[PDB]
């Protein structure tokens, strides 16, 4: 059925699965024209296709050329997403093909089902999780490869860097969703938390800084502080007054539809 809180551990079992997030496929700037009408200008986008067990990210860059002379772009973007996910699955060896594809937005279900008719044993599922994968473009190295692209390109990343050497997939995904939620909620404050101590760098082959286990605990705390601070600012709530249950419930509640 739907992937929710009740079946969360299923994400980290040994059944290959992919999340697909289409929220950055069709991206525009909105501007006034000379005549004072409004026009859009597309910018390069990306499909975010992630294995939550291994951290493997299949970032398909969507170059603005794919929109040229097309209509109903927000509808087309879903079908282009499904077309590219189905092309990625066909490109993978059989033993690497997912058993399940979890779409972050339920508007992706019909397009993906229809493109995947040839794979009746791959389950296409929605999720009750509110995942912050839209914030992928707040990761500097991801934003940079998308914006520099001059043509359609697939780029492969491990979005966990080397964390799985030290932590479980469950913990790695929890860390990723906390970082992306913080970057979604207050990008500048999240980047300052990550990039403050100049002595801790990002390896050439990594996306995130080289924090020790103790430093990751500090960073994670600072990210939860940011999220709670922003929830207080948004709703005009005195957060200093909140209890530990109230706080856990607020940070969790935001990653649940």
């Amino acid at each position: 059925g739907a992937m929710n809180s009740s079946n969360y551990a299923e994400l980290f079992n040994n059944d290959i699965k992919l999340f697909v997030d289409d929220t950055n496929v069709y991206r525009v700037t909105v501007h006034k024209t000379f005549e004072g009408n409004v026009a859009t200008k597309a910018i390069n986008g990306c499909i975010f296709t992630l294995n939550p067990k291994t951290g493997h990210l299949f970032l398909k860059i969507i170059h603005t050329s794919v929109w040229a002379g097309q209509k109903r772009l927000s509808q087309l973007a879903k079908w282009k997403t499904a077309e590219e996910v189905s092309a990625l699955v066909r490109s993978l060896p059989k033993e690497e093909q997912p058993k399940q594809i979890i779409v972050t937005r339920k508007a992706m279900l019909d397009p993906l089902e229809v493109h995947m008719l040839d794979f009746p044993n791959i389950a296409i599922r929605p999720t009750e999780l509110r995942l912050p994968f839209s914030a992928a473009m707040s990761i500097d190295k991801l934003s940079d490869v998308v914006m520099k692209a001059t043509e359609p390109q697939m780029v492969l990343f491990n979005i966990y860097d080397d964390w799985l050497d030290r932590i479980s997939s469950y913990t790695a995904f929890s860390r990723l969703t906390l970082l992306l939620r913080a970057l979604k909620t207050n990008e500048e404050s999240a980047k300052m938390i990550l990039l403050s101590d100049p002595t801790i760098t990002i390896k050439s082959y990594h996306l995130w800084p080289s924090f020790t286990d103790e430093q990751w605990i500090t960073i994670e705390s600072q990210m939860r502080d940011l999220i709670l601070t922003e929830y207080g600012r948004k709703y005009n709530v005195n957060i200093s007054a909140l209890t530990q249950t109230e706080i856990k419930d607020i940070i969790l509640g935001q990653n649940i539809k």
Binding site: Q75, W79, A82, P111, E113, V114, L117, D118
Partner: protein, 300 residues
């Protein structure tokens, strides 16, 4: 001037003949139905007074043979049988008519309702949907499942409607996924009309037969098929003008005949709202839109 005599009526029953119905008492001197109009298929249907779950009937055409009804006390139903002895059959019918023990098919001269509901329905197409090749007439009941329903059990007692599935390789050409899913014209015109039905008359005959089995038996699979065949047309950008105009006539008479008190079980809100207000054909069904808005505005 064709007749379906009954041997007797041992159990109290509501008898339908096409859109008509009448109540027969247990052991009433009832011996059948005369003055059945030649040139159309007919349906004679039953709902037992003591058990409304017993809801079943027979599609027949009096041009194909001499049919009668006899109650079977073992299987507990009114069975259609064919009498091969023409002179015996004529003599039985003559005796019952002389004694006035038959009801007359109550057709009003001005009234084209039954022709309008069966225009495309032919007994040979019925006999391919309902497979019992030893009889010239076809048994249908409330509980018979469709070949589609059976996929998602007894294959000998099934309704062999054409399978329509919008999310199937049959409906969707590799490489034309968005095109074919949003515009069902390929699936309607190439696969269904050119490929399976051969022409719009056969397609409309199956649609009309599905509606009639839905209405007369409360056959749920038949209702699903009727709506699927409407949606397939309404969801196609490219449909011949003659087919759209004919569909509007077909659906108008169906909505006209539907009992108000069954509108809540026989009409699918999603399909009708989609077909009349959202689809490619939202403005092609003027007569159907007007009767739906005037008769069933709560559904819309």
């Amino acid at each position: 001037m064709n007749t379906v005599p009954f041997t007797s009526a041992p159990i109290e029953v509501t008898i339908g003949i096409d859109q008509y119905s009448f109540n027969v008492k247990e052991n009433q001197p009832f011996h059948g139905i005369k003055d059945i109009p030649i040139g159309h298929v007919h349906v004679i249907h039953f709902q037992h007074a003591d058990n409304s779950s017993m809801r079943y009937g027979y599609w027949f055409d009096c041009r194909m043979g001499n049919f009668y009804i006899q109650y079977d006390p073992k299987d507990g139903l009114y069975k259609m049988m064919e009498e091969r002895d023409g002179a015996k059959f004529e003599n039985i019918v003559h005796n019952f008519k002389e004694r006035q023990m038959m009801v007359s098919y109550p057709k009003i001269d001005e009234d084209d309702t039954w022709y309008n509901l069966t225009e495309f329905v032919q007994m040979d197409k019925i006999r391919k949907i309902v497979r019992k090749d030893e009889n010239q007439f076809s048994y249908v009941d409330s509980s018979m499942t469709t070949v589609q329903e059976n996929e998602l059990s007894d294959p000998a007692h099934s309704l062999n409607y054409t399978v329509i599935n919008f999310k199937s390789r049959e409906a969707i050409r590799p490489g034309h996924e968005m095109e074919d899913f949003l515009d069902k014209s390929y699936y309607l015109n190439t696969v269904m009309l050119q490929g399976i039905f051969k022409n719009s008359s056969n397609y409309f005959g199956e649609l009309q037969f599905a509606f009639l089995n839905a209405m007369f038996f409360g056959n749920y699979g038949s209702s699903l098929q009727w709506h699927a065949m409407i949606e397939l047309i309404c969801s196609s950008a490219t449909v011949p003008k003659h087919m759209l105009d004919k569909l509007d006539e077909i659906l108008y008479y169906q909505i006209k005949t539907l009992p108000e008190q069954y509108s809540d079980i026989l009409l699918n809100e999603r399909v009708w709202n989609i077909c009349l207000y959202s689809s490619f054909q939202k403005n092609s069904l003027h007569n159907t839109e007007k009767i739906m808005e005037n008769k069933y505005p709560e559904l819309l």
